[PDB]
Amino acid sequence: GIEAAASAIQGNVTSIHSLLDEGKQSLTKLAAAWGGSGSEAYQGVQQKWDATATELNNALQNLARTISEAGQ
Amino acid sequence: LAQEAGNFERISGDLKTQIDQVESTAGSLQGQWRGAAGTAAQAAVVRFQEAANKQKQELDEISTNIRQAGVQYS
Ligand SMILES: [Zn+2]
Ligand SMILES: [Zn+2]
Ligand SMILES: [Zn+2]
Ligand SMILES: [Zn+2]
């Protein structure tokens, strides 16, 4: 039960981590949308992405580990 | 950027899907938390939901930017 959940969520952890990395690489190529690679707006996008992504990964890892710890 | 746009929508879609999976799995546990560890898990949930809502929000802002730049570039 809570063990199941925790295991499914680990898969999510890995998948989402990978997708956030893909999204970061994509942004690199979309840079024109904010004025190009030398744009402060683009730089801002990338810092926001890094931060949002890191929090998500962090929260996710926490979730997986807490959920397993509970079921214990 | 034109072609990168499709790939980003794909990534965004995959992320939202994975996030929906976590929310669904976690939601199926809303009942059953008990003890101090349960309190911890509930808090872990809320933290994830806040992080995931910020991610989703971000994905939408980025997609809008890309669409609006596309129009401009067209
Ligand atoms: Zn992939
Ligand atoms: Zn990574
Ligand atoms: Zn690409
Ligand atoms: Zn997919």
Numbering used by the authors:
A (entry chain B): 10 to 81
B (entry chain A): 11 to 84
Excerpt from the publication:
WXG100 proteins are a group of proteins of approximately ∼100 residues in length that contain a conserved “Trp-Xaa-Gly (WXG)” motif. To investigate how specific sequence motifs translate into specific structural features, we determined the atomic structures of two representative complexes, the heterodimeric CFP-10/ESAT-6 complex and the homodimeric sagEsxA assembly. The overall structures of the two protein complexes are similar, with both forming a four-helix bundle, in which each monomer consists of a helix-loop-helix structural motif. However, the novelty of this contribution is that by using the iterative bio-informatics approach, we can show that the WXG100 protein superfamily can be divided into three subfamilies: CFP-10-, ESAT-6- and sagEsxA-like.
More recently, we solved the X-ray structure of the same complex (CFP-10/ESAT-6). In addition, it contains a 310-helix with hydrogen bonds originating only from main chain atoms, whereas, the loop of sagEsxA (residues 43–48) consists only of a single tight β-turn. In addition, the WXG-motif of ESAT-6 forms an extended hydrogen-bonding network, where the main chain amine groups of W43-G44-G45 form hydrogen bonds to the main chain carbonyl groups of A40 and A41. In contrast, the WXG loop of ESAT-6 adopts a more rigid conformation due to the extensive hydrogen bond contacts. A FRET signal could only be detected in those samples where donor-CFP-10 was mixed with acceptor-ESAT-6 or vice versa. These results demonstrate that CFP-10 and ESAT-6 exclusively form heterodimer and that heterodimer formation is a spontaneous process.
